[PDB]
Every structure is written in structure tokens, then in C-alpha cells.
Amino acid sequence: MLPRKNLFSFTSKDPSAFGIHLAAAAREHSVYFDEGLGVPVVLRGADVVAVLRDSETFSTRTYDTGIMKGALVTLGGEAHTRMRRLFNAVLSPRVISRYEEATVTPVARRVVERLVRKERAELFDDFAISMPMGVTSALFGLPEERIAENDALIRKMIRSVVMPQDPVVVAEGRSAHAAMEAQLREIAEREVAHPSDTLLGEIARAIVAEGLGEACEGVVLTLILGSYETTSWMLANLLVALLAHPDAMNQLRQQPSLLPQAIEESTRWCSSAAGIVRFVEREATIGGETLAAGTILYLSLIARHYDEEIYPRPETFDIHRRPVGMLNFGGGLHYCVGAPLARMEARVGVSLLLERFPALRADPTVQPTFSTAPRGAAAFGPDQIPALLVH
Ligand code: HEM
């Protein structure tokens, strides 16, 4: 018997209360069975890093189902190394800067332009969502007239990865996947005679450089599923961090090149990634508790961020902290391959929003709530981001 607690149902109006709560609980026990999640959880940063380091004992087997079967994150050993090299090549710094100029800036400009005559915004709906809706179709040569349809298809895929059990929902994921696959096949087949300038174009060419033909559609769908919702929760909590710290927002105006390190601090102070899951391949012990072969284990990617031994005054948002060793993108073998795109999109989007709305600030009349199921999503974050845009 693990000790048992219910820490993930915690809600609050204070964005830092949950990380405080987890770090307090971790002082009491690192490993505990969370009755709200239904699984054992590892809290302490050192235990989480240790689990992530030992991929042979703690695998990604639980992910290897439905539309995720055989995908990058499910892979270990040599299989992962080979496929990971392909992904790394299509998200390298040259590619990131290329798509900064060709795709993300134009999209960010359009998104921000829409707000220009308005007095208020709810920046989750009006920015955090809008960014990846525009960026994903543009990156992958998907038609503008299908953006809503494809949003619904992707949300259905994502639902199926969250509800691996339910065979109707999985079945709906599977169908949505096949419609996306058909659009993306059609686009990928055109690349042979008419190579494009899109990212889906660089992928089709990288598949050949590694001698694969691994489907182009496959790579693209992995990137879509890994970015489409994550991006919105990262943007959402960046905006929270900025709008909640008018002293910091003042410093950023004075010195715009501080934005990247401000982003790094937003990801420590208010990470959107609550946790990830591992499969215990052979009995092991972590923080003194025994974990039977076959256990499904949840790793907190937040508690480390609030451990005062690692980050002093962790409750305080400091844009000069320059923190490292955050867990928001994971650690080890499966460390997020998309992190360069996420960082860039956050920087580009937010810089454009800030420069366009000198008066941008929190709206004092609405009290967002923070939870680990905001609007049902698998994230940590606010239910809305009410802002004032004028004077
Ligand atoms: C915006 C914020 C993002 C966050 C917070 C996030 C977080 C994560 C985390 C925690 C993992 C590790 C999963 C595990 O170890 O179980 C991961 C892996 C991954 N992420 Fe992200 N990510 C984000 C953006 C993206 C983007 C933009 C892409 C695609 C462009 C993407 C694609 C992936 C892929 C493919 C993997 C698997 C990597 C591997 O197994 O080698 N992510 N991400």
C-alpha cells in the first residue's frame, strides 16, 4: 500500500497554488497513489529525472495504442534513435528560422491584426488557440478553407489518445485520422513532381535522406498531435505569467530581447505540462515504494519547479532568474523534439501582441480558475485569459 491522496482535483484562482501544493505534498511523500488520477504518481524532481533516465525499466508502452501505435514516442533502442534523427533534422535551427519568416510571423500578424479594433479579448480563444490553428495548416500545406474541419478532426484524434479505453471514441479517432491521412497523402504525393517550400515538403525530402518510405503522413501526424493543443496551453500560461506581472511586462517593453528568458521563467512558474506516464517493465522501487511490473506510473513535471532547494523563492516570477532544468518538455530519450518550434512560436506571437498593444493588461472583473482539466484539456492552465487592450 502506497499512501493515498487526491492532489490533482485541486482548483484555484491563484496560478501558483497548485505547484506550491505539489511541492508541499512531495516533502511528505515522493510516491503516492492519487485517487483522482487512479495511478501512482512520482513527485520529487530527482525521482522523476531518475525514472526518465531509465527507459528500459520505465517504458512508453502505455502510449503504444490506437493512432499512436508504432509512433516516435512509443519507440526505444535503435528504432527510436533512427526516427528521432529524422525528426531532429526537420526541426533544426535553420528550419525553425525558415518557418519563423515564412509561416509563424505572417500567421501571428493576422492573429494580432484581428484584435486591433477591439476593447477586450479573451486571449485563450483569441490568441492561444488561433496561433496553432493558423500555423499548423500553413506548415503542412493544408488548405485554409478546411481549418475548422481539420480543427475538429484533430480534436477527435486527441480525444482518442486521452480515452484509449472507449472503443467508440477510439473508432472516431481512427476515422478522423484516416481523413487527415487522405488530405496529407494527397499533399505528400504532389511533392514528387512539385516539391513545395512547406515543412511537409522538408519532411518528404528528409525521409529520402534517411532512406525511409516511414510515411511522410506519419511524421506530419506525429507533429500535429504533439503540437496542436500543447502549443495553446504554453501560450496560454505565458500570457498568464506576463499579464499577472505588470513589473515584468514593463521591463519587457523597455528590453524586448528579454522575452526568451521570460518565456523560460513562465514555463517554470506556470508550466502547462502537468505530467507524463511510464509503464513499469520490471519490479522497481522509487522513493521506497514498490512498483510491481505492469504498473502505470504518472510523473509530475511541475513539483520540481516549486522545490525551493532547486529554485529559490519558487513562487516568485523573476524574468532575470534564467532558470534551467525545467521538466515541461520532459527529459531523457523522449525529450520533446518540438521544443524549438514551441519556443519560437511563443516568442514570435507574444512579441507581436506586446508591441501592438502597449496597454495590454489583465481584466480586473473576471477571475479565471486554474486546474489540471481546464476546459477538459490534459494540461495545467486557466479557463480563460480575460484582457484589456486599450488606454
Ligand atoms: C508547446 C509545448 C509543448 C510541450 C509542453 C510539450 C511537451 C512534451 C513532453 C513532456 C514530451 C515528453 C513525452 C514523454 O516523455 O512521455 C514531449 C514529446 C514530444 N513532443 Fe512535445 N511539447 C510541446 C510542443 C511540441 C511541438 C510544438 C511538437 C511538434 C512540433 C511536439 C512534438 C513532440 C514529439 C513528437 C514528442 C515525442 C518525442 C520522442 O519520443 O522522441 N511537441 N513533448
Ligand SMILES: [Mg+2]
Ligand atoms: Mg531544459
